[PDB]
Amino acid sequence: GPMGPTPFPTAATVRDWSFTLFDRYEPVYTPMCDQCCYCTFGPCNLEGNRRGACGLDMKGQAAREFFLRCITGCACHSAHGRHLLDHIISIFGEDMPINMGASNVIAPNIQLITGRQPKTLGDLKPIMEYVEEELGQLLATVHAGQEGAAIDYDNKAMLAGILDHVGMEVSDIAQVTALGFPKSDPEAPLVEVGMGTLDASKPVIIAIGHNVAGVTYIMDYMEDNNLTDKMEIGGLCCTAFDMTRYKREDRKPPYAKIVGTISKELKVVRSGIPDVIVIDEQCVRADLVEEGKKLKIPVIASNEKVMYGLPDRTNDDVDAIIEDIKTGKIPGCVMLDYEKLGELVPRLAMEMAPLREGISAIPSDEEMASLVAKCVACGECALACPEELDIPDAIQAAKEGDFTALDFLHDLCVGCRRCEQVCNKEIPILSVIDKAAQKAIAEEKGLVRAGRGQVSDAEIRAEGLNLVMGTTPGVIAIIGCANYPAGSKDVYRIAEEFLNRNYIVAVSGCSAMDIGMYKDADGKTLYERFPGRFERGNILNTGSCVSNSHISGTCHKVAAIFAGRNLSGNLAEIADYTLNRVGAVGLAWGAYSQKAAAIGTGCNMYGIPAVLGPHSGKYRRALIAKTYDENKWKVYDSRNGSELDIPPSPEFLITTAETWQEACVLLAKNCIRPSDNNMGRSIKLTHWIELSEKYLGVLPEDWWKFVRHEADLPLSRREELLKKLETEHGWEIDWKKKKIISGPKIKFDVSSQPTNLKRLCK
Amino acid sequence: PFEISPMFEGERVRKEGMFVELGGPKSLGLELVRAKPMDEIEDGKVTIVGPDLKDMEEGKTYPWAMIFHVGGELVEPDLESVIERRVHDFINYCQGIMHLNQRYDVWMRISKDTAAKMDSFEPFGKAVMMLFKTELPFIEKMQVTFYTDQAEVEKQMAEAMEIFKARDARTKDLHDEDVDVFYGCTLCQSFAPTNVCVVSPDRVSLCGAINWFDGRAAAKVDPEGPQFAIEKGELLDAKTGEYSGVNEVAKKLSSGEFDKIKLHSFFDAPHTSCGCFEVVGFYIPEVDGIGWVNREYQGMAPNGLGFSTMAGQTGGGKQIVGFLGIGINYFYSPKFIQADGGWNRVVWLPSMLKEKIDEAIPDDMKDKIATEKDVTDIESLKTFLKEKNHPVVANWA
Amino acid sequence: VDTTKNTKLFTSYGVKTSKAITTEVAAKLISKAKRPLFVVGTGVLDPELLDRAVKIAKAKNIPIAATGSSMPGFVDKDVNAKYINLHQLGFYLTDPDWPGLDGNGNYDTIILLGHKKYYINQVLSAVKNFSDVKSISIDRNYIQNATMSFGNLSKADHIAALDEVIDLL
Ligand code: SF4
Ligand code: SF4
Ligand code: SF4
Ligand code: SF4
Ligand code: SF4
Ligand code: NI
Ligand code: NI
């Protein structure tokens, strides 16, 4: 029916909104290099904001690099979605209706961007097509001499981010509708997570990747032959969530297990636990064969994206492949036929379990003593460590029978092996750390909730009242990868702190795995302490990486439920509404991948601020606003069209934080919105002040910038803060009524409607 | 003493980690707020009769009646219950103190560390009184009395029973003609800009969290805030609940979206809902009836739509004719959709909603409303209303 | 205690590189700053590092930007310190019109102590490429993107160098 101005958008159509965002949130470029390696006219030295042979300055180069990362992430999501959709339509038919959950808008991102309302599975076919076409255009911008300004690369990156969100939504909708995933279930079944959950007394299959097509066939073969009680299947990365959501809408406990994030990927292979490894698409270490052939661990590729230089045995007989892998020259094969793979992997694991027994890279106690005695403290390993761990100090401590420093370093290490390749003594430091933390690994057991899907249109209404009556301080979306600066406990600490204050915490991806890994002193995890509903003090795990499209979609639904705004082709309107009214902040503590960059950029284009880990400064682009400049904090009143002041929150669209206390303070502060009433503003100020005092020893210096009314102040210390306002700031206050009569620079008016667009003013 | 913060609301003091249990199922617990003139009320005073915090033994249960005496220039007993409605939250603002239920079902516990730190009941009552004076500033003076003897608590509980019965009767007998002002709420305008809400004694608010007394107390706290008082003025239609003052205030605060708002009406300028209604109401035109669906119903109505779809067409602060959002206590209103025939128009209801609101359906219309068990499709609904003589049969010619 | 010895890196940001200075040159540059800003990180919470940082800041009345969660260390102390994000500080330093923490104007030279390499290097990339604010690194890691920096040092060597710099301020 009614359509907005931007259906099927391009770089020109979303230029106005992106430019409006960049006028307030200026881009900050932190180049990862002083040179350009792109074309034979180079490499060009752009240091000091100089120009290349093509006239491109270093700011433009950084913008182009970030744009390339965003489009690579978008391409990954869209290609995974396209392959999943094609397989699903081939197997289940093109007329299958979309069954996502109890909702009014089943595809909020698709409706928001394209403007269409898909009903069946085939309705998703054109949308994917559009995305891929646009991808080509965007990819054409990576060519040399294809853009001169950095702002035009930032706008194209924003377009790439929103297209990425569309692709993730398409993929998740297809997979959930087809493979019987949980449909917005607040009581999703719990699944074990950790390296100490795989019983080494049974054959072990380990699936690494992000797809689920072949994993479903493997599980079907296991179930049909009743091998589920004697063979253990584990998942690394998002395929663990995808396999633990398979047919789990009935809440039956799943036999599949979750091993961990990318960090564990090599470590498990080092332990000899896996008996067969299958690799699907992405987040797969490019040296699994190198460290697996040493332990006689077969590695099987299953997708054309990743063939790992292996022989292609697709058109063959399973028995011959089994015999060659068992006693032969090939450490694996590429098996692109899904039925053949689902039949081959279980039999191969069964026949390899009794033959690879007693093989692991963990050194003996005497072997580890000799290894720790071999070091000379040359400092190369600490120089090559991505996390800058103090390896030589730990080795020096362990030289005298003190194996606890390596035990501490085990959690901080990411298992990247970069320290081993610079050691002239050939000391396997990763295996040394694993040997020192063997007992801790054996103790690693946790529980996580399976992917519920999207948030239903009933929980949003149930939580809107709590958000407007000042009982829900905001929404925190803990997502991203697992390249943490100081171990996997930081996400757990942040989630626990925000759940203790009755926030709405939504988790997905590797962060959910690394949060559900720390049991409490009572032997409980956060998912068991707090239910999986969309309500205050509750934590819900949406699912795999492609489930993040739901979280952003949730924001869109808030615009489409309480305000009644049209979603079809209304990117600018809904983005403005989310930026001005909805209090939701994303947190990507360990993001490394280009997919994380695409997700963060797409969230920024929807108006959702994000705080990332200290490593994310390597992404070369952030979006920060100048607090001091008062002329960049003005909007229009959608009733008068006049200029209206707003508090300086959110003060960034994407930023980085070093420690988790700083992240907690930033997340608490950035939940504030200009349109907040007295109760919401009061509760947000309360929590922000409390967190600042607890984690910084001081209370914020800009708190007074968020006090429009005497009801804006916290309840506990109202008089203590009013006295400070009168004394430190000189405001005029009445003491009998405890009322601020003068001093605020913005009079409270709940009916005011902030807008960044002049085209929607009376 | 301790630290007051809204963080310690989920703090559950378990039986293995608590000094003393106050009230609960085994004992008899009570809380009460009483309004008195501002000459017998002493601010910053707590009277404790019998045992105190330092005269108690671990792992026991005590009656623990709490009585609050408030006093102020603009304080009347009609808001007493309103004050009680906050007591719970305030008790859950003190770290290590757990409060459960309200009225005469209270259950307050105390933690080991908190009990060892306070050593008396004076600071806790003082903190509670300071919060209630900070929250509702019109309360000039406040005093608390704590009873821990079984006999005294039984006497106070008998008095509280009589007081609660009187209060419930007074609340029930209140009507729209016993008052001269309604109360407007615009707190939802943070997410629904052009949405105004009007609450009257004969029409509970949209979300169920606001009544006439709640809005009245909020307006007393801040007259010019988002909770304000409306003068009804000249009544224009008693059947359709039209008031000139309400009409003009809606026109002013609606940014010119709806000119009129007719209370207790379904098709003529109905009340405007944002998204937060506890109950939604749809109009079946084939049967010329009204059905209602609550937020928790996972089934589908006879038209084939659930709560989400049928609530996605009545919201945004607009005034679309058809589906209407209401609360849960609106069924008990005597003027419940009066200009639509009232209960004579309700045709379908889910089983849970009927079992919940049985007290509102008249004895003659109880065997006249379909349920999901009885009716699955629209033809089944027609046959059911043809068999059981629903008054909507007459409208079919 | 010679700091200009281990100028060793794992990766290179290009051809332009930091100058490895001695204790005397660092003391002279700190004492000759027109408007210095002691940018400190969460890694200064080590008691020796915290004491040396407080002594350095109070020796020349240098205002402190306690980036990260380093503020609780300076609450009990006397040095004028304010909290600010490191990324936000890097964005602000590339603006000549920024009033600063005191509102007296933008800064000239920033002293860095107690930071992670991959973070301070990323911020210093923008700072040193899109502004003229000089950076002096007195950390035990050799920072490439700083204008002047110490070399790769042991913790005892770093403590000794900081003490010598204190005695030469
Ligand atoms: S960005 Fe990387 S590939 Fe490009 S010039 Fe710099 S170091 Fe080389
Ligand atoms: S693209 Fe431009 S800056 Fe890069 S190498 Fe080629 S000419 Fe030099
Ligand atoms: S690289 Fe090897 S020899 Fe050098 S310090 Fe590290 S462990 Fe010791
Ligand atoms: S494997 Fe671990 S310890 Fe070695 S360099 Fe990588 S992160 Fe550092
Ligand atoms: S729905 Fe309730 S809380 Fe919201 S504006 Fe209306 S009366 Fe107020
Ligand atoms: Ni509402
Ligand atoms: Ni509503």
To the nearest 10°, the Cα dihedral for B123, B126, B131, B137? -160
In whole angstroms, how far apart are CA A295 and each of A174, A290, A609, B366? 38, 9, 46, 75
Say if CB B259 and CB B251 are below 8 A apart.
Answer: yes
N- to C-terminal Cα separation, chain B:
75
The secondary element (H helix, E strand) that includes residue A65 is helix A58-92
Q: Does B274 touch chain A (CB under 8 A)?
A: yes
- Compare CB distances from C69 to A379, A652, A659 and report the shortest one's residue: A659
C151 neighbors A383 (Cβ within 8 angstroms) = no
- For residue A138, the distance in angstroms to the closest alpha carbon of chain C comes to 26
- SS3 for A510-532 is HHHHHHCCCCCCCCCCHHHHCCC
Q: Do A615 and C118 touch (CB under 8 A)?
A: yes
Residues A203, A209, A210, A215, Cα dihedral to 10°: -30
Dihedral of the alpha carbons of B370, B371, B376, B380, in degrees to the nearest 10? -20
Residue (of A509, A532, A526, A538) closest to A446 by Cα position:
A526
Chains C and A touch (3+ CB pairs under 8 A): yes
Q: Estimate to the nearest angstrom the gap between the alpha carbon of A354 and the chain centroid.
A: 39
Distances (CA, A) of A277 to A200, A256, A360, B321, C93: 15, 15, 15, 61, 50
Q: State which residues have CB under 5 angstroms from ligand 6, the bound ion.
A: B 188, 274, 276
Residue B44: other Cβ atoms inside 10 A: 14
Chains that touch B (3 or more CB pairs under 8 A): A
Question: At what angle are helices A548-561 and A459-468 packed, to 10 degrees?
Answer: 70
Residue B267: CB atoms within 10 Å: 14
For residue A34, the chain C residues in CB contact (below 8 A) are 13-16, 129
Ligand nearest the Cα of residue A419 is: 4
φ and ψ at C33, to 5 degrees?
A: -70, 135
**B50, two tokens:** 């019998």
Experimental method: cryo-EM
Residues counted in chain A: 762
Cα–Cα distance measured from residue A650 to residue A61, given in angstroms and rounded to the nearest whole number:
28
| Sign, CA torsion A710/A715/A720/A724 | negative
Determine the residue of chain B that is closest to A565 in CA distance.
Answer: B316
The nearest CA of chain A is from the CA of B150 a distance in Å of 34
Q: Judge whether A714 and B4 are in contact, CB under 8 Å.
A: no
- What lies within 8 Å, CB to CB, of A232 at 6+ separation is A198, A199, A202, A203, A204, A205, A257
Chain B nearest C-alpha distance from A678 (Å): 9
Tell me which DSSP letter residue A540 carries.
E
- Interface membership of C129 toward A (CB under 8 Å): yes
Question: Which residue type does B208 have?
Answer: G
For A654-674, give one letter per residue: b (16+ CB within 10 A) or e. bbbbbbbbbbbbbbbbbbbbb
Q: Which of C3, B24, B86 is nearest to A469 (CA)?
A: B86
For A162-206, give the DSSP string. HHHHHHHHHHHHHHHHHTT---S-TTPPEEEESGGGS-TTS-EEE
Q: Extract the tokens encoding A293.
A: 């052939």
Which residues of chain C are within 8 Å of residue A695 when distances are taken between CB atoms? 69, 72
The set of protein residues with a Cβ atom below 6 angstroms from ligand 5 is: B 185-188, 197, 205-207, 210, 274, 276
Buried b (16+ CB within 10 A) or exposed e, A507-520: bbbbbbbbbbbbbe
CB distance A66 to A153 below 8 Å: yes
**C-alpha closest to that of C61 among C82, C88, C40, C37:** C37
| B207 annotated binding-site participant | no
Give the burial string for A266-305 (b: 16+ CB within 10 Å, else e).
bbbbbbbbbbbbbbbbbbbbeebbebbeebebbbbbbbeb
Sheet containing A634-637: give its strands across. A643-645, A634-637, A754-755
Q: Which residues have CB under 8 Å from A471's CB, separation 6+? A: A502, A536, A679, A683
Strands (E), A521-582: 538-541
Nearest to A607 by CA among A653, A548, A669, A673: A653
Do residues A632 and A607 lie in contact, with contact meaning Cβ atoms separated by under 8 Å?
A: no
| CA-CA-CA-CA torsion sign (A451, A456, A460, A462) | negative
What's the token pair of residue A286? 């490019």
Pairwise CA distance, residues A568 & B199, whole Å: 35
Interchain pair A618, C118: CB under 8 A: yes
Q: CA dist B73 to A7, A32, A64, B220, Å?
A: 60, 68, 68, 11
- Minimum Cα–Cα distance from A691: chain B residue: B7
β-pairing, B141-147 vs B45-49, is: parallel
Radius of gyration (C-alpha) of chain C in whole angstroms: 15
Measured between CA atoms, the residue of chain B closest to residue A682 is B6
**A474 φψ region: left (φ > 0), alpha (ψ -120 to 50), beta (else):** left
Q: How many A from CA of B180 to the centre of ligand 5?
A: 21
Helix (H, G, I), strand (E, B) or coil at C38: strand
A interface test, pick of C5, C122, C124 with most A CB neighbours within 10 Å: C122
Is A58 near ligand 1, meaning CB less than 6 Å away? no
Tell me which H or E stretch contains A405: helix A404-412
Helix runs in chain C, H state only: 23-31, 47-59, 71-75, 86-93, 117-129, 155-167
Burial pattern B220-237, b for ≥16 Cβ within 10 A else e, equals bbbeebbbbbbebeeeee
Cβ separation B190–A676 shorter than 8 A = yes
Buried b (16+ CB within 10 A) or exposed e, A540-574: bbbbbbbbbbbbbbbbbbbbbbbbbbbbbbbbbbb
The answer to whether the beta carbons of residues A564 and A449 sit under 8 Å apart is no
Contact call for C and B: 3+ CB–CB distances under 8 Å: no
What lies within 8 Å, CB to CB, of A720 at 6+ separation is none
**CA–CA separation, A177 and A552 (whole Å):** 19
Interface touch A379/C10, C-beta < 8 Å? no
Report how far residue C36's alpha carbon sits from residue C82's, in angstroms, rounded to the nearest whole number. 14
**What does residue C105 show for φ and ψ, rounded to 5 degrees?**
130, 170
**Could you write out the DSSP letters of every residue in A219-269?**
HHHHHHTT-TTT-EEEEETHHHHHHHSTTGGG-PPPS-EEEESTTHHHHHH
Nearest 5°: the CA angle A295, A296, A301 is 115
Q: Give the pair of three-digit tokens for residue C156.
A: 């005892």
DSSP per-residue letters across A609-626: -EEE-GGGGGGSEEEEE-
C-alpha distances in Å from residue B40, one per residue of A531, B34, B37 = 48, 12, 7
Helices A391-398 and A404-412: angle between axes, nearest 10 degrees: 150
The crossing angle, in degrees rounded to 10, of helices A429-436 and A404-412 is 110
CB contact under 8 A, A458 and B315: no
d(CA A236, CA A222): 19
Neighbours of chain C (3+ CB pairs under 8 A): A
Two tokens at A430?
Answer: 């990763």
CB atoms A563 and B134 under 8 Å: no
Which DSSP letter does residue A674 get?
Answer: T
> Which atom of ligand 4 is nearest to A417's Cα?
1
